[PDB]
Design a binder for this molecule. Structure first.
Ligand SMILES: Nc1ncnc2c1ncn2[C@@H]1O[C@H](CSCC[C@H](N)C(=O)O)[C@@H](O)[C@H]1O
Ligand code: NA
Lengths: 265, 265
């Protein structure tokens, strides 16, 4: 009679919370999705081992089109768990799954876990200063999407930081790198010429948030576009004007150039 | 000789990540602060009992002025942990403490935990749509804070939602309720008359996120300003233009008036 939406956290199998692990161990069935994101620091096997339950993996279609036929039926007579990387309900289409649950006479509860939305605080940028977020998508054929460029523009105009998620193709396990995202943005700037993203733009790169040894780098595009940030996934952040305290952290912790203390403050 | 910043999560001791627990159990000394937020579902004892360590609670002064004199000295010879509610670097000034660690020659690591910043996803509101955030601070003496009103106005104009952290006076065990925040906002509206926050403004209240049965309510100020949302902590959210699915969730899950389903595109 109960469906538990349980977050797996940021990077590996230990990023799930104590509450989440125990509840998962008490469930009769366990489902999971790895299409919105992937636990780059672990494997399905390790997650299964830690929880001690077999895990039924669901595709994007299984979820969006048949959640009520695959997951909800079982939850009507048992305790069911639905695991997602990060914090449940952050992925924009997940909140609606609780509506489906209610409609099926199934109670649902949410077990939170660390999300990149809050984890980016490790960059030293004040969380309250972040504005609208966007995802950088690869162009395709005749389609050249650039909305993410406008998001950066509207945020920075008001001193707000912009968190940029990078395109990902889970099935094919192909991630977009920060370096690639920067190239794309430089190309979008050359078209809209709005003075939003150039070689002189300051950016921050966060890789492997959640691991004990994440990669936090800050600096100008011209110096980071070819730098090696390590294994995916990467997160790109275009900061707005900085509070001196944020700048001091980027310099001391993310190896940013002293220059930002006078140029971006 | 290392310093670990470890988040405890939203509501109780089980909101700590598995990683956080394992590492905290093997630390020589454990410090913590409980003034930046309220974990309504647990006690120091339970947390100590969980990690199996005595915990020295530090006041805002001990931290902001003597962190390098109380905590860092031990981190040079032992493995020290600093515990905080939610995620340690979210809506706090704790990030700067890492700079102090560096300067004292102490290596530091950050272990995230569920934060209210991502937990807002449980309101049905698309998290990528949130704009700049703010805090509704209690007026003191003749000083009446009002900046948070402009943040709401600025976000709303661009169709972005606004997350409002609520004030806390730890040493007085006082935690601002969404009701109090609403009253303060109406007073500011009367003072500025921008038409930003009135009796007809739709708002969302999330209380005790992290608990199994949080209070999630959405509706017009006039109807919610006096409603009982339960014990703190509370956060108030002023949504911007809603997507149809956000509205459906607010109505089906947060009990919002069916009329909000009719969005003015
Ligand atoms: N479980 C919870 N439910 C509702 N609001 C919460 C909450 N935890 C924190 N808050 C809100 O956030 C304020 C503290 S701000 C500090 C936030 C913390 N580092 C985090 O990561 O969540 C509180 O006064 C309250 O308004
Ligand atoms: Na945000």
């Amino acid at each position: 009679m109960v469906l538990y939406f349980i977050g797996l956290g940021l990077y590996d199998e230990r990023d799930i919370t104590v509450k989440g692990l125990e509840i998962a161990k008490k469930c009769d069935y366990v489902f999971a999705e790895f299409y919105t994101s992937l636990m780059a620091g672990t494997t399905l096997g390790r997650i299964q081992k830690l929880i001690g339950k077999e895990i039924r993996v669901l595709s994007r279609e299984d979820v969006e089109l048949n959640f009520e036929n695959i997951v909800l039926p079982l939850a009507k007579e048992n305790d069911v768990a639905f695991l997602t990387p990060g914090d449940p309900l952050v992925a924009t289409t997940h909140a609606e799954l609780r509506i489906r649950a209610k409609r099926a006479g199934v109670e649902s509860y949410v077990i939170h876990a660390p999300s990149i939305y809050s984890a980016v605080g490790i960059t030293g940028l004040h969380i309250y200063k972040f504005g609208k977020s966007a995802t950088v998508a690869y162009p395709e054929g005749n389609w050249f999407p650039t909305s993410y460029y406008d998001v950066i523009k509207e945020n920075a105009e008001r001193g707000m930081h912009t968190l940029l998620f990078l395109d990902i193709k889970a099935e094919k396990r192909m991630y977009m790198t920060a370096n690639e995202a920067m190239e794309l943005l430089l190309k979008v700037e050359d078209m809209k010429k709005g003075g939003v993203f150039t070689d002189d733009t300051l950016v921050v790169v966060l890789a492997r948030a959640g691991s004990l040894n994440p990669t936090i780098r800050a600096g100008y595009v011209k110096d980071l576009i070819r730098e090696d940030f390590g294994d995916p996934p990467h997160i790109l952040i275009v900061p707005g004007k900085l509070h001196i305290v944020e700048a001091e952290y980027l310099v001391e912790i993310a190896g940013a150039p002293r220059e930002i203390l006078r140029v971006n403050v």
